[PDB]
Amino acid sequence: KFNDGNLNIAYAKPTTQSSVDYNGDPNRAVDGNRNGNFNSGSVTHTRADNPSWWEVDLKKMDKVGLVKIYNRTDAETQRLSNFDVILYDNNRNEVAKKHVNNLSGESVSLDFKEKGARYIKVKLLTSGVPLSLAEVEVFRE
Ligand SMILES: [Ca+2]
């Protein structure tokens, strides 16, 4: 629930994703654990979808500052590349979007500058690539 004194509003929020493989259910990216080893149980996994995506529902409109996305680390780390992070309002209108080409480290941090949104979606833009996320943390500033 807090990370380095900052309230992670994504923690334990409802999630969904495009599909599930290897029991990589979407709630694994809001389980409070940043571990990126798939075999730990901390990491999501879809099938090879067109495209693969994951989403957290904050349950109401809230304010989105920092979004920190933690990749899988044990293998296939390149799969988290060429992807959008999209904010949606209560009517599922897109209110902001950032594109991430790839990660040089284990995570990427995006700042949505307090944009009002209820849903945050991570969407791969490459067909037929599974999406795996170790964790997605969302802060209000
Ligand atoms: Ca996790």
mmCIF file with all atom_site columns, C-alpha atoms and ligand atoms in Angstrom:
data_model
loop_
_atom_site.group_PDB
_atom_site.id
_atom_site.type_symbol
_atom_site.label_atom_id
_atom_site.label_alt_id
_atom_site.label_comp_id
_atom_site.label_asym_id
_atom_site.label_entity_id
_atom_site.label_seq_id
_atom_site.pdbx_PDB_ins_code
_atom_site.Cartn_x
_atom_site.Cartn_y
_atom_site.Cartn_z
_atom_site.occupancy
_atom_site.B_iso_or_equiv
_atom_site.pdbx_formal_charge
_atom_site.auth_seq_id
_atom_site.auth_comp_id
_atom_site.auth_asym_id
_atom_site.auth_atom_id
_atom_site.pdbx_PDB_model_num
ATOM   1   C  CA . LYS A 1 1   ? 0.000   0.000   0.000   1.00 0.00 ? 1   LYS A CA 1
ATOM   2   C  CA . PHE A 1 2   ? 2.896   2.482   0.632   1.00 0.00 ? 2   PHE A CA 1
ATOM   3   C  CA . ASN A 1 3   ? 6.135   2.535   -1.315  1.00 0.00 ? 3   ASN A CA 1
ATOM   4   C  CA . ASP A 1 4   ? 8.827   4.818   0.027   1.00 0.00 ? 4   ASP A CA 1
ATOM   5   C  CA . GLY A 1 5   ? 6.187   6.838   1.812   1.00 0.00 ? 5   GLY A CA 1
ATOM   6   C  CA . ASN A 1 6   ? 3.975   7.235   -1.204  1.00 0.00 ? 6   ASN A CA 1
ATOM   7   C  CA . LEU A 1 7   ? 0.496   5.698   -1.258  1.00 0.00 ? 7   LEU A CA 1
ATOM   8   C  CA . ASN A 1 8   ? 0.156   3.218   -4.131  1.00 0.00 ? 8   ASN A CA 1
ATOM   9   C  CA . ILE A 1 9   ? -3.480  3.529   -5.082  1.00 0.00 ? 9   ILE A CA 1
ATOM   10  C  CA . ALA A 1 10  ? -3.266  0.550   -7.485  1.00 0.00 ? 10  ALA A CA 1
ATOM   11  C  CA . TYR A 1 11  ? -2.545  -1.965  -4.756  1.00 0.00 ? 11  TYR A CA 1
ATOM   12  C  CA . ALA A 1 12  ? -5.213  -4.660  -4.539  1.00 0.00 ? 12  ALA A CA 1
ATOM   13  C  CA . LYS A 1 13  ? -7.473  -2.859  -7.007  1.00 0.00 ? 13  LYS A CA 1
ATOM   14  C  CA . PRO A 1 14  ? -9.486  -4.878  -9.509  1.00 0.00 ? 14  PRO A CA 1
ATOM   15  C  CA . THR A 1 15  ? -7.555  -5.859  -12.631 1.00 0.00 ? 15  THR A CA 1
ATOM   16  C  CA . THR A 1 16  ? -8.165  -7.547  -15.908 1.00 0.00 ? 16  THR A CA 1
ATOM   17  C  CA . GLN A 1 17  ? -6.101  -8.544  -18.849 1.00 0.00 ? 17  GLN A CA 1
ATOM   18  C  CA . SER A 1 18  ? -6.478  -9.787  -22.393 1.00 0.00 ? 18  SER A CA 1
ATOM   19  C  CA . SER A 1 19  ? -6.152  -13.452 -21.388 1.00 0.00 ? 19  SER A CA 1
ATOM   20  C  CA . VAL A 1 20  ? -4.260  -15.564 -18.904 1.00 0.00 ? 20  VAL A CA 1
ATOM   21  C  CA . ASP A 1 21  ? -1.451  -18.122 -19.453 1.00 0.00 ? 21  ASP A CA 1
ATOM   22  C  CA . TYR A 1 22  ? 0.785   -19.959 -17.032 1.00 0.00 ? 22  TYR A CA 1
ATOM   23  C  CA . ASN A 1 23  ? -1.598  -18.868 -14.236 1.00 0.00 ? 23  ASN A CA 1
ATOM   24  C  CA . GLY A 1 24  ? -0.281  -15.340 -14.611 1.00 0.00 ? 24  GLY A CA 1
ATOM   25  C  CA . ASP A 1 25  ? -3.500  -13.750 -13.398 1.00 0.00 ? 25  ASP A CA 1
ATOM   26  C  CA . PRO A 1 26  ? -3.729  -9.953  -13.622 1.00 0.00 ? 26  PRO A CA 1
ATOM   27  C  CA . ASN A 1 27  ? -3.956  -9.396  -9.896  1.00 0.00 ? 27  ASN A CA 1
ATOM   28  C  CA . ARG A 1 28  ? -0.302  -10.384 -9.701  1.00 0.00 ? 28  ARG A CA 1
ATOM   29  C  CA . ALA A 1 29  ? 0.695   -6.866  -10.879 1.00 0.00 ? 29  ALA A CA 1
ATOM   30  C  CA . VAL A 1 30  ? -1.093  -5.269  -7.932  1.00 0.00 ? 30  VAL A CA 1
ATOM   31  C  CA . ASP A 1 31  ? -0.052  -7.760  -5.254  1.00 0.00 ? 31  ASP A CA 1
ATOM   32  C  CA . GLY A 1 32  ? 2.434   -5.397  -3.633  1.00 0.00 ? 32  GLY A CA 1
ATOM   33  C  CA . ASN A 1 33  ? 5.416   -7.445  -4.782  1.00 0.00 ? 33  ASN A CA 1
ATOM   34  C  CA . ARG A 1 34  ? 7.902   -6.047  -7.245  1.00 0.00 ? 34  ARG A CA 1
ATOM   35  C  CA . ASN A 1 35  ? 9.616   -9.433  -7.794  1.00 0.00 ? 35  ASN A CA 1
ATOM   36  C  CA . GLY A 1 36  ? 9.986   -9.980  -11.539 1.00 0.00 ? 36  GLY A CA 1
ATOM   37  C  CA . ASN A 1 37  ? 10.841  -13.686 -11.447 1.00 0.00 ? 37  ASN A CA 1
ATOM   38  C  CA . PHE A 1 38  ? 7.872   -15.390 -13.053 1.00 0.00 ? 38  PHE A CA 1
ATOM   39  C  CA . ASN A 1 39  ? 8.341   -18.501 -10.930 1.00 0.00 ? 39  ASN A CA 1
ATOM   40  C  CA . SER A 1 40  ? 7.779   -16.350 -7.783  1.00 0.00 ? 40  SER A CA 1
ATOM   41  C  CA . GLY A 1 41  ? 4.073   -15.949 -8.447  1.00 0.00 ? 41  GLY A CA 1
ATOM   42  C  CA . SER A 1 42  ? 4.421   -12.136 -8.601  1.00 0.00 ? 42  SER A CA 1
ATOM   43  C  CA . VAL A 1 43  ? 4.218   -11.712 -12.376 1.00 0.00 ? 43  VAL A CA 1
ATOM   44  C  CA . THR A 1 44  ? 1.348   -11.643 -14.828 1.00 0.00 ? 44  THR A CA 1
ATOM   45  C  CA . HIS A 1 45  ? 1.219   -13.432 -18.129 1.00 0.00 ? 45  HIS A CA 1
ATOM   46  C  CA . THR A 1 46  ? -1.253  -13.306 -21.000 1.00 0.00 ? 46  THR A CA 1
ATOM   47  C  CA . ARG A 1 47  ? -1.534  -15.556 -23.995 1.00 0.00 ? 47  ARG A CA 1
ATOM   48  C  CA . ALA A 1 48  ? -0.216  -14.336 -27.271 1.00 0.00 ? 48  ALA A CA 1
ATOM   49  C  CA . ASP A 1 49  ? -3.003  -11.903 -27.899 1.00 0.00 ? 49  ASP A CA 1
ATOM   50  C  CA . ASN A 1 50  ? -3.789  -9.309  -30.595 1.00 0.00 ? 50  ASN A CA 1
ATOM   51  C  CA . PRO A 1 51  ? -2.649  -7.348  -28.700 1.00 0.00 ? 51  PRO A CA 1
ATOM   52  C  CA . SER A 1 52  ? -1.912  -8.302  -25.159 1.00 0.00 ? 52  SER A CA 1
ATOM   53  C  CA . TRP A 1 53  ? -3.019  -5.793  -22.514 1.00 0.00 ? 53  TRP A CA 1
ATOM   54  C  CA . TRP A 1 54  ? -3.492  -5.433  -18.793 1.00 0.00 ? 54  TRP A CA 1
ATOM   55  C  CA . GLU A 1 55  ? -5.600  -2.879  -16.896 1.00 0.00 ? 55  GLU A CA 1
ATOM   56  C  CA . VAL A 1 56  ? -6.193  -1.720  -13.351 1.00 0.00 ? 56  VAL A CA 1
ATOM   57  C  CA . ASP A 1 57  ? -9.518  -0.153  -12.282 1.00 0.00 ? 57  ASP A CA 1
ATOM   58  C  CA . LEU A 1 58  ? -9.123  2.431   -9.490  1.00 0.00 ? 58  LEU A CA 1
ATOM   59  C  CA . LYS A 1 59  ? -12.906 2.074   -8.845  1.00 0.00 ? 59  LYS A CA 1
ATOM   60  C  CA . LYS A 1 60  ? -13.624 5.790   -9.203  1.00 0.00 ? 60  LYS A CA 1
ATOM   61  C  CA . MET A 1 61  ? -12.034 8.766   -10.864 1.00 0.00 ? 61  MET A CA 1
ATOM   62  C  CA . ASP A 1 62  ? -8.822  9.613   -9.096  1.00 0.00 ? 62  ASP A CA 1
ATOM   63  C  CA . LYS A 1 63  ? -5.722  11.708  -9.823  1.00 0.00 ? 63  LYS A CA 1
ATOM   64  C  CA . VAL A 1 64  ? -2.715  9.970   -11.460 1.00 0.00 ? 64  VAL A CA 1
ATOM   65  C  CA . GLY A 1 65  ? 0.847   11.202  -10.907 1.00 0.00 ? 65  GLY A CA 1
ATOM   66  C  CA . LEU A 1 66  ? 3.688   8.721   -11.071 1.00 0.00 ? 66  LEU A CA 1
ATOM   67  C  CA . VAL A 1 67  ? 2.981   5.333   -12.685 1.00 0.00 ? 67  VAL A CA 1
ATOM   68  C  CA . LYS A 1 68  ? 5.792   2.889   -12.182 1.00 0.00 ? 68  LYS A CA 1
ATOM   69  C  CA . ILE A 1 69  ? 5.843   -0.316  -14.201 1.00 0.00 ? 69  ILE A CA 1
ATOM   70  C  CA . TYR A 1 70  ? 8.042   -3.206  -13.243 1.00 0.00 ? 70  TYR A CA 1
ATOM   71  C  CA . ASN A 1 71  ? 9.050   -5.707  -15.881 1.00 0.00 ? 71  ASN A CA 1
ATOM   72  C  CA . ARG A 1 72  ? 9.464   -9.453  -15.689 1.00 0.00 ? 72  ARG A CA 1
ATOM   73  C  CA . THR A 1 73  ? 13.203  -10.097 -14.943 1.00 0.00 ? 73  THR A CA 1
ATOM   74  C  CA . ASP A 1 74  ? 13.953  -13.785 -15.243 1.00 0.00 ? 74  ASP A CA 1
ATOM   75  C  CA . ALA A 1 75  ? 13.423  -14.230 -18.957 1.00 0.00 ? 75  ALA A CA 1
ATOM   76  C  CA . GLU A 1 76  ? 11.748  -12.742 -22.011 1.00 0.00 ? 76  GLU A CA 1
ATOM   77  C  CA . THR A 1 77  ? 12.351  -9.199  -20.695 1.00 0.00 ? 77  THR A CA 1
ATOM   78  C  CA . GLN A 1 78  ? 12.244  -7.739  -24.193 1.00 0.00 ? 78  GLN A CA 1
ATOM   79  C  CA . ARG A 1 79  ? 8.495   -8.472  -24.429 1.00 0.00 ? 79  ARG A CA 1
ATOM   80  C  CA . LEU A 1 80  ? 7.825   -5.244  -22.469 1.00 0.00 ? 80  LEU A CA 1
ATOM   81  C  CA . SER A 1 81  ? 8.672   -2.934  -25.374 1.00 0.00 ? 81  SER A CA 1
ATOM   82  C  CA . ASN A 1 82  ? 6.740   -0.858  -27.909 1.00 0.00 ? 82  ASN A CA 1
ATOM   83  C  CA . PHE A 1 83  ? 3.793   -0.283  -25.619 1.00 0.00 ? 83  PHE A CA 1
ATOM   84  C  CA . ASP A 1 84  ? 1.312   2.366   -24.565 1.00 0.00 ? 84  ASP A CA 1
ATOM   85  C  CA . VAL A 1 85  ? 0.193   3.358   -21.076 1.00 0.00 ? 85  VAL A CA 1
ATOM   86  C  CA . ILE A 1 86  ? -3.269  4.775   -21.339 1.00 0.00 ? 86  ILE A CA 1
ATOM   87  C  CA . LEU A 1 87  ? -5.502  6.545   -18.826 1.00 0.00 ? 87  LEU A CA 1
ATOM   88  C  CA . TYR A 1 88  ? -9.270  6.333   -19.157 1.00 0.00 ? 88  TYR A CA 1
ATOM   89  C  CA . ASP A 1 89  ? -12.072 8.166   -17.443 1.00 0.00 ? 89  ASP A CA 1
ATOM   90  C  CA . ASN A 1 90  ? -15.282 6.769   -15.921 1.00 0.00 ? 90  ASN A CA 1
ATOM   91  C  CA . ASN A 1 91  ? -16.802 6.356   -19.408 1.00 0.00 ? 91  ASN A CA 1
ATOM   92  C  CA . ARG A 1 92  ? -13.672 4.747   -20.796 1.00 0.00 ? 92  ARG A CA 1
ATOM   93  C  CA . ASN A 1 93  ? -12.639 7.821   -22.776 1.00 0.00 ? 93  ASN A CA 1
ATOM   94  C  CA . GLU A 1 94  ? -8.935  8.138   -23.241 1.00 0.00 ? 94  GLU A CA 1
ATOM   95  C  CA . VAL A 1 95  ? -7.664  11.090  -21.229 1.00 0.00 ? 95  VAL A CA 1
ATOM   96  C  CA . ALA A 1 96  ? -3.868  10.594  -21.553 1.00 0.00 ? 96  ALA A CA 1
ATOM   97  C  CA . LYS A 1 97  ? -1.384  8.262   -23.221 1.00 0.00 ? 97  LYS A CA 1
ATOM   98  C  CA . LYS A 1 98  ? 2.377   7.743   -23.107 1.00 0.00 ? 98  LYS A CA 1
ATOM   99  C  CA . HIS A 1 99  ? 4.412   5.481   -25.350 1.00 0.00 ? 99  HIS A CA 1
ATOM   100 C  CA . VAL A 1 100 ? 7.329   3.508   -24.056 1.00 0.00 ? 100 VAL A CA 1
ATOM   101 C  CA . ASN A 1 101 ? 9.776   2.058   -26.592 1.00 0.00 ? 101 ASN A CA 1
ATOM   102 C  CA . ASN A 1 102 ? 11.762  -0.040  -24.207 1.00 0.00 ? 102 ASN A CA 1
ATOM   103 C  CA . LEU A 1 103 ? 13.260  -0.204  -20.761 1.00 0.00 ? 103 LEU A CA 1
ATOM   104 C  CA . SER A 1 104 ? 16.925  0.148   -20.092 1.00 0.00 ? 104 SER A CA 1
ATOM   105 C  CA . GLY A 1 105 ? 16.344  -0.992  -16.504 1.00 0.00 ? 105 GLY A CA 1
ATOM   106 C  CA . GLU A 1 106 ? 13.898  -3.292  -14.706 1.00 0.00 ? 106 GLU A CA 1
ATOM   107 C  CA . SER A 1 107 ? 11.204  -0.633  -14.551 1.00 0.00 ? 107 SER A CA 1
ATOM   108 C  CA . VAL A 1 108 ? 9.930   2.565   -16.183 1.00 0.00 ? 108 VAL A CA 1
ATOM   109 C  CA . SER A 1 109 ? 8.420   5.591   -14.469 1.00 0.00 ? 109 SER A CA 1
ATOM   110 C  CA . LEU A 1 110 ? 5.844   7.832   -16.136 1.00 0.00 ? 110 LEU A CA 1
ATOM   111 C  CA . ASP A 1 111 ? 4.375   11.044  -14.734 1.00 0.00 ? 111 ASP A CA 1
ATOM   112 C  CA . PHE A 1 112 ? 0.787   11.813  -15.744 1.00 0.00 ? 112 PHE A CA 1
ATOM   113 C  CA . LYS A 1 113 ? 0.818   15.060  -13.748 1.00 0.00 ? 113 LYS A CA 1
ATOM   114 C  CA . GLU A 1 114 ? -2.343  14.484  -11.699 1.00 0.00 ? 114 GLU A CA 1
ATOM   115 C  CA . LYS A 1 115 ? -4.628  13.673  -14.650 1.00 0.00 ? 115 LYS A CA 1
ATOM   116 C  CA . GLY A 1 116 ? -8.123  12.529  -13.653 1.00 0.00 ? 116 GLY A CA 1
ATOM   117 C  CA . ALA A 1 117 ? -8.656  8.878   -14.527 1.00 0.00 ? 117 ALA A CA 1
ATOM   118 C  CA . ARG A 1 118 ? -10.282 5.671   -13.318 1.00 0.00 ? 118 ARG A CA 1
ATOM   119 C  CA . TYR A 1 119 ? -8.461  3.063   -15.450 1.00 0.00 ? 119 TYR A CA 1
ATOM   120 C  CA . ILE A 1 120 ? -4.820  2.571   -16.342 1.00 0.00 ? 120 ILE A CA 1
ATOM   121 C  CA . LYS A 1 121 ? -4.089  0.223   -19.223 1.00 0.00 ? 121 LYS A CA 1
ATOM   122 C  CA . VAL A 1 122 ? -0.727  -1.214  -20.410 1.00 0.00 ? 122 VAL A CA 1
ATOM   123 C  CA . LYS A 1 123 ? -1.106  -2.283  -24.020 1.00 0.00 ? 123 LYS A CA 1
ATOM   124 C  CA . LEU A 1 124 ? 1.583   -3.917  -26.139 1.00 0.00 ? 124 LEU A CA 1
ATOM   125 C  CA . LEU A 1 125 ? 1.509   -2.662  -29.685 1.00 0.00 ? 125 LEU A CA 1
ATOM   126 C  CA . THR A 1 126 ? 3.106   -5.796  -31.215 1.00 0.00 ? 126 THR A CA 1
ATOM   127 C  CA . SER A 1 127 ? 0.686   -8.581  -32.127 1.00 0.00 ? 127 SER A CA 1
ATOM   128 C  CA . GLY A 1 128 ? 1.225   -12.030 -30.719 1.00 0.00 ? 128 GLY A CA 1
ATOM   129 C  CA . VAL A 1 129 ? 3.535   -11.077 -27.838 1.00 0.00 ? 129 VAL A CA 1
ATOM   130 C  CA . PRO A 1 130 ? 2.565   -12.069 -24.290 1.00 0.00 ? 130 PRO A CA 1
ATOM   131 C  CA . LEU A 1 131 ? 2.347   -9.307  -21.735 1.00 0.00 ? 131 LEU A CA 1
ATOM   132 C  CA . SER A 1 132 ? 3.978   -9.946  -18.384 1.00 0.00 ? 132 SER A CA 1
ATOM   133 C  CA . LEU A 1 133 ? 4.151   -7.337  -15.635 1.00 0.00 ? 133 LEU A CA 1
ATOM   134 C  CA . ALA A 1 134 ? 5.807   -7.837  -12.277 1.00 0.00 ? 134 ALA A CA 1
ATOM   135 C  CA . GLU A 1 135 ? 3.954   -4.879  -10.754 1.00 0.00 ? 135 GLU A CA 1
ATOM   136 C  CA . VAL A 1 136 ? 2.237   -1.628  -11.623 1.00 0.00 ? 136 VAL A CA 1
ATOM   137 C  CA . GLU A 1 137 ? 2.272   1.031   -8.954  1.00 0.00 ? 137 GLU A CA 1
ATOM   138 C  CA . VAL A 1 138 ? 0.197   4.238   -9.200  1.00 0.00 ? 138 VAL A CA 1
ATOM   139 C  CA . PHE A 1 139 ? 0.605   7.350   -7.084  1.00 0.00 ? 139 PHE A CA 1
ATOM   140 C  CA . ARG A 1 140 ? -1.512  10.512  -6.880  1.00 0.00 ? 140 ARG A CA 1
ATOM   141 C  CA . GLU A 1 141 ? 1.438   12.820  -7.462  1.00 0.00 ? 141 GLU A CA 1
HETATM 142 CA CA . CA  B 2 .   ? 3.662   -8.419  -8.396  1.00 0.00 ? 1   CA  B CA 1
#
